[PDB]
Paper text:
The deposition of tau aggregates in the brain is also the pathological hallmark of dozens of dementias and movement disorders known as tauopathies, including progressive supranuclear palsy (PSP), Pick’s disease (PiD), chronic traumatic encephalopathy (CTE), and corticobasal degeneration (CBD). Identical copies of tau stack into long β-sheets, which in turn mate together tightly to form steric zippers; these fibrils are a common feature of all amyloid diseases. To learn how RNA interacts with tau at the atomic level and triggers fibril formation, we determined the cryo-EM structure of the fibril of recombinant full-length tau induced by RNA.
To discover how RNA induces tau aggregation, we determined the cryo-EM structure of RNA-induced full-length tau fibrils to an overall resolution of 3.4 Å. The twisted tau-RNA fibril exhibits a pitch of 829 Å. It is composed of two protofilaments related by a pseudo 21 screw axis. The protofilaments are composed of flattened tau molecules stacked in parallel, in-register β-sheet alignment. Notably, this region of tau has been characterized as a disordered fuzzy coat in all previously determined structures of tau fibrils, which includes the ex vivo fibrils from AD, CBD, PSP, GGT (globular glial tauopathy), and CTE patients as well as heparin-induced fibrils.
Residue numbers in the entry:
A (entry chain G), B (entry chain C), C (entry chain B), D (entry chain F), E (entry chain J), F (entry chain L), ...: 391 to 426
Write the structure that this text describes.
RNA sequence: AAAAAAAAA
RNA sequence: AAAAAAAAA
């Protein structure tokens, strides 16, 4: 038994929010829960 | 048994929100729950 | 048994929301639940 | 048994919402549940 | 048994909503459930 | 047994909504359930 | 047994809604269930 | 002077190549200039 | 002078290549200039 | 002079290559200039 | 002079390559200039 | 002179390469100039 | 002269390469110039 | 002269490479110039 | 002359390489010029 | 003929 | 009838 690279992962992995935003001249809110 | 690259993953993986946004001249809200 | 590249994944994977948006001159909301 | 590239995946994969939007001069909402 | 490229997938895959939209001068809503 | 490229998929695959829309000067809603 | 390219798929595949729409000067709704 | 929706466009608009192709079990090339 | 929605565009707009392709079990090339 | 929404754009806009491709079990190249 | 939303853009905007690709079980190259 | 939202942009904006790719079980190259 | 939100931008803005890629079980290269 | 929010930018802005990549079980290279 | 928020920027701004990568079980290289 | 979703800290 | 492109540090 020889394994050279084994990143074994068992279970749950959750990356829920992924945003790539480029905004050169801007007013911007990223993932913002603004209320009232 | 020889494996050279084994990223074995068992279970659940959830990437729910993925946004690529380019907005050069803009007012912009990205994944924003603005309420009232 | 020799495997050179084995990204074995068993289970559930869910990428629910995927948006690619380019908006040069814009007011824009991306994946935004604006309420009232 | 020699396999050179095996991305074996068993289970369920769901990419529900996929939008490619280019909007140069625009007011735009992408995947937005605006209510009232 | 030699396989050179085997992306074996067993189960269910569902890409329900796929929209390619180009809208240069526009007000536009893409996959938007606007209510009232 | 030698197979050079085998993307074997068994099960169910459903791409329900596929729209290609080009709308240069426009007000447009794409896959939008606007109610009232 | 040598197969050079085998995208074997067994089961059910359903692409229900496919629309190609070009609308240069337009107000347009594509696959829109507008109610009332 | 009151206009409710005016997507006025003046000039030239050219959508030269528009193809809607559904091909369930197929080898297919779409708008492909294969040479030799 | 009151205008409610005016996406006025003057000039040239050219959407030359528009293809909607669904190909469930397939080898396919889309808008591919394969040479020799 | 009151205008409520004016995305005025003057000049040239060119969306040359627009492809919507769903390919569940497939080897596929999309907008690929493969040479020799 | 009152304007409520004016994303005025003057000049040239060019979104040349726009591809929406869903490929569940696949070997795929997207906008790839593979040479020799 | 009262303007409420003015993202005025004058000049040239070029979003040349825009790809939305979902590939659940796959070997895939996205916008890759692989040579020899 | 009262302006409420003015992200005025004059000049040139170029977002050349924009890719949104979801690849759950995969070997993948994104915007990779692999040579020889 | 009263301006409430003025992110005035004059000149050149260039966001050349923008990639959003989710790859749960994977060997992956992102924007990698691997040579030989 | 009253301005409430003025982030005035004149000149050149260049954000050349922007990558958002989520890779749960993986061997991965991000913006890596690996040579030989 | 369809759908969906989500989330969070 | 077309096209394109790019890039970089």
């Amino acid at each position: 038994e020889i394994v050279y690279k084994s990143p074994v992962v068992s279970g749950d992995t959750s990356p829920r929010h992924l945003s790539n935003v480029s905004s050169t001249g801007s007013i911007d809110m990223v993932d913002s829960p603004q209320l009232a």
